[PDB]
Design a protein around this ligand. Structure first.
Ligand SMILES: Nc1ncnc2c1ncn2[C@@H]1O[C@@H]2COP(=O)(O)O[C@H]2[C@H]1O
Ligand SMILES: Nc1ncnc2c1ncn2[C@@H]1O[C@@H]2COP(=O)(O)O[C@H]2[C@H]1O
Ligand SMILES: Nc1ncnc2c1ncn2[C@@H]1O[C@@H]2COP(=O)(O)O[C@H]2[C@H]1O
Ligand SMILES: Nc1ncnc2c1ncn2[C@@H]1O[C@@H]2COP(=O)(O)O[C@H]2[C@H]1O
Lengths: 192, 192, 192, 192
């Protein structure tokens, strides 16, 4: 009930803002669809709760909420439990919509992404689709490894729920667990 | 209605503060005129909404709100779409009033400015007005390029609505898109 | 009464979040037990109050709240009053529960801990318990001194109330008071 | 009225916190006296208002609120208007009480202080009072210039209203206006 009020609250002011900005209907609808899809009529916080509790509770909760993702990512198979715990506590939940470009070829990158659910296309600079990726895969790591630029664009086919890891956190966890930098570099190369 | 309440709320406490500080009437009136001009009786947030949505929605909204500015700035003509998107997502809205000095000659600079609407005078250290700038122009870039000091003062003739880019973001976008540093340096020099 | 309302407020939304996340009952109960143990039905802030007052009031309040801890830590015996004041103003209160791992062997460390109340086991990488520590002791300092990795795990036997000092603050206070780095290094070595 | 409600609000929760912490009566009274002295039954914000307005309004308001201080500080006599404006916009208001040590000899310093109103004693490491300072004077600059340690303690005789400048801002304004570093160094030395 408190989570429901939070959402109705939010949605009212969103529609007011979109009115003052005279946003086109297509864009107003994109935004309303996003709130509905992501929040489904309820807005808790989690950030507040996480901060009120111990580091142990935060790890336990992050591990549970990310259980399905961890099981779906072959990358995490046989990984050190401390590695998995560190990553899941640093992941940020993100949602994207059909046809959204999560990544543009040739730009700088600030984070990488793990796919919880959804399908994305990997699009080369010439416009050819190299491949599509889905649940349990990840992308946007190459740029973080080379500190150069994005080598392909990534476009959502469906609604996508992703968990991102920032370049700062990425570099942190790979230093703490060097074995995982090695395994990561190997897939980067094998994205030919 | 919620945006209207936010504004009446705000204005009440502003007048109370100005009373405790015994601000002169001329200054109280300047402040009230500013709130009226900028907010026009309604205070949404945008910062909250932007943070609740995807990076794609943020780009779409920033691109739409900055559409007229982008069209008016010759600098953006033929620019890479990714460049324009990066800039507009980093711009900060600012409003200044007639006779305000946005920039003082001889000081350090922390940001540059794009003029959405308004007229400013460029005033040399001797007091001569070199020129006036208006909608679609920009200023305050020289200091960011040289990392030295402001070479002129800039004084508002009218109410001005500006979008600023901080030195940190300025240096970020120019590194990401070096071609635009080149075009920027060329106008800097051609401000003779 | 205001502190009580704050807590009932909080607990209501916590149970709602745990419902949306379908947390297992064991974990829901761990979280509820934590809030009850730590806050005991009342949530003040302290952070807000500390920020509304002078540095002197902040030192006086931190010194009083940490009086028992300071008396129990032999480390503080004969220490410079300015050293003790600096530390207590930088400590962060943390609570952990029975069987929680505060520290895992082999990871990077971001802070050290002083035990106000509770018992922890020091567990070597082979699983042998080297020793147990309790009220007035401290742990997690070795990693901060070597800038290497945690050399043992630390597991709570009881509920534990700890005060942590971050690596940044740790390095600050030791620079300001070098004599205490010396005394600290000596115990680090004498954790054989 | 809104400022009055804010204060009664605040004071209620302060007394509740002091109760949970079982603070001694002398300290509870020190805190209540501080709130009464500083806020006088009304809590506006200023930080919120400053952030809602232009840089020009912020400079105008800071200049007005600091007018008496600026007039009382001989240091500002003949100074560049841009220097004075920069400083006043970076000052932080602080209040201290009789017998408070604002500065302890031998510690590291994070800021310096301008005295709006009040009297402080400068106390050497041997306990001799070198001198007393009052309205329009400043102290705590030596440590910022040498990047060493505080050379004396500073103890309030009366209630003191001060404006502090952090080491980061201090170093900023002195770089922007080198002439003022020179004048500052000269008084530092002439504090024999
Ligand atoms: N052939 C490929 N197969 C799978 N993923 C790819 C391929 N080429 C590029 N990518 C991904 O697309 C991402 C785009 O941005 P990055 O260059 O950071 O890293 C990229 C890789 O994660
Ligand atoms: N002759 C000129 N014509 C147009 N703009 C100018 C001229 N001289 C200076 N400026 C602008 O005035 C701004 C003042 O601060 P900056 O030195 O950062 O950069 C400056 C340029 O943007
Ligand atoms: N033999 C020991 N006796 C007491 N404390 C210990 C012993 N071995 C390790 N520790 C503590 O266990 C902590 C684990 O993390 P750190 O390596 O940072 O530092 C460690 C010391 O504080
Ligand atoms: N003889 C003095 N006369 C006036 N002020 C002094 C004297 N000696 C020290 N101070 C001030 O006392 C302050 C204590 O800390 P700082 O060393 O940063 O800088 C100091 C000077 O501002």
């Amino acid at each position: 009930d408190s989570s429901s009020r939070q959402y109705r609250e939010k949605l009212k002011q969103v529609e007011e803002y979109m009115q003052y900005r005279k946003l086109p209907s297509h864009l107003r609808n994109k935004i309303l669809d996003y709130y509905e899809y992501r929040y489904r009529g309820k807005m808790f916080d989690e950030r507040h709760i996480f901060r009120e509790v111990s580091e142990s509770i935060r790890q336990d909760v992050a591990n549970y909420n990310c259980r399905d993702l961890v099981a779906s990512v072959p990358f995490f198979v046989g990984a050190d439990s401390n590695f998995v715990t560190r990553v899941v506590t640093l992941l940020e939940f993100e949602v994207f919509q059909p046809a959204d470009y999560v990544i543009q070829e040739g730009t700088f990158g600030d984070r990488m992404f793990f796919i919880q659910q959804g399908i994305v296309d990997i699009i080369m600079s010439d416009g050819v689709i190299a491949t599509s990726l889905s649940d349990g895969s990840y992308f946007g790591e190459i740029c973080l490894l080379t500190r150069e630029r994005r080598v392909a664009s990534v476009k959502c086919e469906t609604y996508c729920t992703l968990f991102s890891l920032s370049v700062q956190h990425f570099n942190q966890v790979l230093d703490e667990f060097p074995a995982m930098r090695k395994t990561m570099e190997e897939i980067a190369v094998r994205r030919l």
